[PDB]
Amino acid sequence: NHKVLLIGKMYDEIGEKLLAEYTNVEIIKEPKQHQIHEAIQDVSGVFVRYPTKLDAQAIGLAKNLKVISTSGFGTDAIDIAAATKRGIVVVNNPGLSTTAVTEHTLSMILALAKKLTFLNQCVKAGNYLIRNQVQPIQLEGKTLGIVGLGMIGSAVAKICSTALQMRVLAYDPYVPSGKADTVRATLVQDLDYLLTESDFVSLHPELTDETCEMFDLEAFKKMKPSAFLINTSRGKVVRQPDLVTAIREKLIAGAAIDVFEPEPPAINNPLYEFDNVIFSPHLAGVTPEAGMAAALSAANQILQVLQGEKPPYIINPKVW
Amino acid sequence: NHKVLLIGKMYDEIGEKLLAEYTNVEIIKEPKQHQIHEAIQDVSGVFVRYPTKLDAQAIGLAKNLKVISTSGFGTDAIDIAAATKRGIVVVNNPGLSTTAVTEHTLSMILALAKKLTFLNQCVKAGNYLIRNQVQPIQLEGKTLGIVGLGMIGSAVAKICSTALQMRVLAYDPYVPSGKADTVRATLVQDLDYLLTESDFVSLHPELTDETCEMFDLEAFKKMKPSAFLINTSRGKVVRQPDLVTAIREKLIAGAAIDVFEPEPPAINNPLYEFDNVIFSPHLAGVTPEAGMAAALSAANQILQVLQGEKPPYIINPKVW
Ligand SMILES: NC(=O)c1ccc[n+]([C@@H]2O[C@H](COP(=O)([O-])OP(=O)(O)OC[C@H]3O[C@@H](n4cnc5c(N)ncnc54)[C@H](O)[C@@H]3O)[C@@H](O)[C@H]2O)c1
Ligand SMILES: NC(=O)c1ccc[n+]([C@@H]2O[C@H](COP(=O)([O-])OP(=O)(O)OC[C@H]3O[C@@H](n4cnc5c(N)ncnc54)[C@H](O)[C@@H]3O)[C@@H](O)[C@H]2O)c1
């Protein structure tokens, strides 16, 4: 008897089939606003594919709505205030993609070190002789600076220190030094030391008021001119105009970016111009395996709310 | 009193400085044939930067020449027959870049799995919404097929099986099964099984009559349509027209190529057209660290011959 609207497909169809066994499911892909308005009127649950926005108008039209689930961690595209006003439960699906982001981070570190995209373009252009001018970087013995020694930061640190034989430094004010020792990294309390020491800086912190735009022009100035920045965390950790300046003025050597501010990025983003910046469209956490886990978690939590059971990942717990 | 000619720079200047302390060194970069002819007339030793060719004419003009050293393993660009006729020692510099090629191989496996070059182009073109159509591959649990369980094959196997938690199969007729167990791989005697099982096939064999063009159309037909080929070994291991067919006809999903046949490749190579084939210009073994080791080895062996000491890596030992 309950109806559920998926605003965008889940990252794996198993969550859609789980929902369809217990509710009447409708899926709308890259919808126009009027389609959201018509399809949401009588549904009891809503799923939102990141980074699609769910606004106050649509929530106000959703007369029967009891639960909203995002596809992953981020809830910035949901008008949570409007949902909370109406007593609607908002749920996210976090921490299900550690392995996916760890692998993606490694791919980006290696791609920057081996100058992958540049050398590929040179060969295809007939310039095999570029090998007389540029050489890859050997990762062994170089220093990797990890900002945020959490689930993904620790996993990346462990692979880079042991398999790749890098020297790993980690900055994270909320962790004991023993947590870095576990993954054969060294914890450092001075972010400046991490910046001046690192040949690769990879960002993995939680986004907070403290980490918001912590990577600004002053940070890039302290980094080695030869160093690379990798960001798979959140776009707001980096102040985008300063990264543009830093790349253009050669304060750093390059960057690999999976996350943007804003999300989605505009089509004229000034970073696109630079051949030493490489991009993925917020996919580090979206392998099929991570997608299946997130889709099951989203489907489960919707069904839980509809049956009056408290789900694990409520974002606005005061409505419960 | 001895003069030495470097036909191309070494991969690190330390070898040039070592030579200049004991001999009179001249360096010519991307030289025309007439420059080789003039500079080689009176030199006692010659260094050749891969893949530059040293032909019978130049050797015949080199009246005082006693030793020729390549920059790395490959000697196919040297007219060894002509050198041997004149009693000239030919030396290569092999096995000094295991870590460099291992890292490069990993970079290419990860770049193919994460669809790096394609997703980068999509974002820069304003197509962030490609994330609704393509997803990265999670390496954990996938099968890597290694052809050739030597120094580089073993090192790659070990990282992929342990750090990346892949299932690793290895084909190598000259190795005991215990050598695969050491790196948490399984040795397989049926190359067909490796082909049908593997999601990634990475080539690391010695080039022999047996491995020459072992990766031909029949091999690609047996591979999974979803699988990727990585080749950092030698270009002649793959029959290039068949790889073109295999890519065009979607017998396999993509490839990453560091080595070519012929070397250097022509500017109209038919593989360049395909966006799912990525290239590096024979640089997997050429980091600064590998380059310094090879340059010291080349400089040492030249000086050894000039002082009548047998060098370790003679390619034509019957002249000694
Ligand atoms: N690109 C994607 O698809 C994707 C997927 C999953 C997670 N993420 C993001 O990646 C990042 C890491 O994820 P996680 O699961 O490891 O989170 P986590 O909660 O396990 O760890 C985050 C770390 O950030 C640390 N931190 C907090 N403040 C800090 C500060 N001022 N300086 C340095 N570190 C600080 C915390 O102490 C914690 O250890 C998060 O921003 C997460 O939202 C991105
Ligand atoms: N791209 C570069 O810059 C670069 C640099 C160094 C080496 N290489 C090449 O990489 C490859 C691996 O180098 P390595 O140092 O590990 O060599 P290696 O001699 O240590 O191992 C080569 C392996 O090939 C195996 N092999 C022989 N015949 C085989 C067959 N029919 N099928 C499967 N395996 C077979 C041998 O048994 C051996 O174990 C070689 O071709 C080498 O010349 C390339």
Side-chain angles (χ1 to χ4, degrees):
Chain A
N1 70 118
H2 283 299
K3 310 215 305 196
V4 174
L5 176 62
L6 308 204
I7 306 183
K9 272 207 284 198
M10 285 174 170
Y11 291 136
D12 186 292
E13 297 168 13
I14 189 177
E16 321 179 341
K17 289 171 186 185
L18 175 54
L19 284 171
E21 171 58 33
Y22 298 96
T23 68
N24 286 100
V25 179
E26 180 177 11
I27 298 100
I28 63 180
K29 310 190 201 176
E30 294 172 24
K32 259 78 196 77
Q33 292 301 311
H34 83 275
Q35 314 166 227
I36 293 170
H37 300 166
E38 292 148 13
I40 206 170
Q41 279 200 348
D42 52 357
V43 303
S44 300
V46 168
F47 171 90
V48 181
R49 182 185 184 93
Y50 190 81
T52 295
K53 293 170 166 155
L54 213 226
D55 73 1
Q57 185 192 4
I59 292 171
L61 291 171
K63 292 312 179 67
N64 299 324
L65 181 56
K66 288 165 183 160
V67 53
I68 301 161
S69 174
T70 58
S71 50
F73 170 82
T75 60
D76 279 354
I78 315 301
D79 193 329
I80 297 164
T84 288
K85 286 170 195 132
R86 273 167 55 39
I88 297 168
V89 175
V90 176
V91 120
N92 72 341
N93 296 277
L96 275 21
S97 55
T98 298
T99 303
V101 183
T102 297
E103 292 180 7
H104 204 91
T105 301
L106 298 172
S107 173
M108 282 177 146
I109 291 163
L110 278 162
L112 292 170
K114 303 313 177 181
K115 308 175 156 50
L116 195 135
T117 64
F118 174 77
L119 287 176
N120 180 49
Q121 284 194 13
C122 284
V123 169
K124 293 185 191 246
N127 191 16
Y128 167 101
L129 288 178
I130 193 64
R131 77 189 299 281
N132 294 338
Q133 279 85 58
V134 328
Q135 287 177 335
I137 292 161
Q138 185 155 302
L139 287 185
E140 171 185 73
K142 307 292 182 299
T143 292
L144 173 66
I146 282 163
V147 177
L149 196 68
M151 293 299 298
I152 292 163
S154 299
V156 173
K158 180 179 182 173
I159 289 176
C160 293
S161 63
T162 65
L164 294 173
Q165 282 304 301
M166 306 186 71
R167 171 175 176 250
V168 184
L169 303 181
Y171 177 78
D172 189 326
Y174 304 104
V175 135
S177 68
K179 193 179 183 186
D181 300 341
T182 296
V183 295
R184 297 238 266 93
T186 305
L187 193 62
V188 297
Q189 299 300 314
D190 192 1
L191 181 58
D192 293 350
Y193 183 65
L194 181 145
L195 296 175
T196 56
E197 288 287 296
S198 295
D199 306 301
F200 300 82
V201 179
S202 188
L203 310 185
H204 307 279
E206 179 181 4
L207 174 62
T208 71
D209 291 353
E210 205 173 23
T211 58
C212 188
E213 299 191 4
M214 64 176 292
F215 269 73
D216 58 12
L217 190 73
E218 294 305 314
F220 294 129
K221 293 173 67 168
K222 299 184 174 77
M223 289 181 57
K224 294 186 189 190
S226 52
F228 298 95
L229 178 77
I230 299 89
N231 191 20
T232 63
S233 61
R234 297 289 152 183
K236 283 181 269 160
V237 177
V238 175
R239 180 166 174 90
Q240 181 187 272
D242 292 341
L243 178 59
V244 172
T245 310
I247 291 292
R248 193 202 311 287
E249 301 198 8
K250 300 179 173 169
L251 300 181
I252 63 170
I257 300 295
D258 183 64
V259 297
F260 304 84
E261 163 58 20
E263 301 253 9
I267 57 171
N268 57 335
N269 189 299
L271 285 170
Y272 293 169
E273 176 211 321
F274 300 106
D275 295 339
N276 59 334
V277 183
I278 62 184
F279 297 88
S280 49
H282 203 121
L283 282 175
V286 191
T287 59
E289 287 83 353
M292 168 178 294
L296 288 176
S297 175
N300 259 331
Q301 285 189 101
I302 289 172
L303 299 175
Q304 283 176 326
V305 171
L306 292 189
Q307 293 162 354
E309 312 172 21
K310 184 185 193 301
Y313 302 122
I314 300 186
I315 292 300
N316 55 347
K318 289 185 169 185
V319 301
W320 192 260
Chain B
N1 70 118
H2 283 299
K3 310 215 305 196
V4 174
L5 176 62
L6 308 204
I7 306 183
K9 272 207 284 198
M10 285 174 170
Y11 291 136
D12 186 292
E13 297 168 13
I14 189 177
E16 321 179 341
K17 289 171 186 185
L18 175 54
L19 284 171
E21 171 58 33
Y22 298 96
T23 68
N24 286 100
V25 179
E26 180 177 11
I27 298 100
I28 63 180
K29 310 190 201 176
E30 294 172 24
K32 259 78 196 77
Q33 292 301 311
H34 83 275
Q35 314 166 227
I36 293 170
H37 300 166
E38 292 148 13
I40 206 170
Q41 279 200 348
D42 52 357
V43 303
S44 300
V46 168
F47 171 90
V48 181
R49 182 185 184 93
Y50 190 81
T52 295
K53 293 170 166 155
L54 213 226
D55 73 1
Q57 185 192 4
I59 292 171
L61 291 171
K63 292 312 179 67
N64 299 324
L65 181 56
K66 288 165 183 160
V67 53
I68 301 161
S69 174
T70 58
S71 50
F73 170 82
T75 60
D76 279 354
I78 315 301
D79 193 329
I80 297 164
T84 288
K85 286 170 195 132
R86 273 167 55 39
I88 297 168
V89 175
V90 176
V91 120
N92 72 341
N93 296 277
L96 275 21
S97 55
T98 298
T99 303
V101 183
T102 297
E103 292 180 7
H104 204 91
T105 301
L106 298 172
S107 173
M108 282 177 146
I109 291 163
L110 278 162
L112 292 170
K114 303 313 177 181
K115 308 175 156 50
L116 195 135
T117 64
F118 174 77
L119 287 176
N120 180 49
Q121 284 194 13
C122 284
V123 169
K124 293 185 191 246
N127 191 16
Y128 167 101
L129 288 178
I130 193 64
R131 77 189 299 281
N132 294 338
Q133 279 85 58
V134 328
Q135 287 177 335
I137 292 161
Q138 185 155 302
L139 287 185
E140 171 185 73
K142 307 292 182 299
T143 292
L144 173 66
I146 282 163
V147 177
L149 196 68
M151 293 299 298
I152 292 163
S154 299
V156 173
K158 180 179 182 173
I159 289 176
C160 293
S161 63
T162 65
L164 294 173
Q165 282 304 301
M166 306 186 71
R167 171 175 176 250
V168 184
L169 303 181
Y171 177 78
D172 189 326
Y174 304 104
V175 135
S177 68
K179 193 179 183 186
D181 300 341
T182 296
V183 295
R184 297 238 266 93
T186 305
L187 193 62
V188 297
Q189 299 300 314
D190 192 1
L191 181 58
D192 293 350
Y193 183 65
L194 181 145
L195 296 175
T196 56
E197 288 287 296
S198 295
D199 306 301
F200 300 82
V201 179
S202 188
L203 310 185
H204 307 279
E206 179 181 4
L207 174 62
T208 71
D209 291 353
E210 205 173 23
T211 58
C212 188
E213 299 191 4
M214 64 176 292
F215 269 73
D216 58 12
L217 190 73
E218 294 305 314
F220 294 129
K221 293 173 67 168
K222 299 184 174 77
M223 289 181 57
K224 294 186 189 190
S226 52
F228 298 95
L229 178 77
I230 299 89
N231 191 20
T232 63
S233 61
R234 297 289 152 183
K236 283 181 269 160
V237 177
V238 175
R239 180 166 174 90
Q240 181 187 272
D242 292 341
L243 178 59
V244 172
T245 310
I247 291 292
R248 193 202 311 287
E249 301 198 8
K250 300 179 173 169
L251 300 181
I252 63 170
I257 300 295
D258 183 64
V259 297
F260 304 84
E261 163 58 20
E263 301 253 9
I267 57 171
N268 57 335
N269 189 299
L271 285 170
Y272 293 169
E273 176 211 321
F274 300 106
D275 295 339
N276 59 334
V277 183
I278 62 184
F279 297 88
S280 49
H282 203 121
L283 282 175
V286 191
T287 59
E289 287 83 353
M292 168 178 294
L296 288 176
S297 175
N300 259 331
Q301 285 189 101
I302 289 172
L303 299 175
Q304 283 176 326
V305 171
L306 292 189
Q307 293 162 354
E309 312 172 21
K310 184 185 193 301
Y313 302 122
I314 300 186
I315 292 300
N316 55 347
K318 289 185 169 185
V319 301
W320 192 260

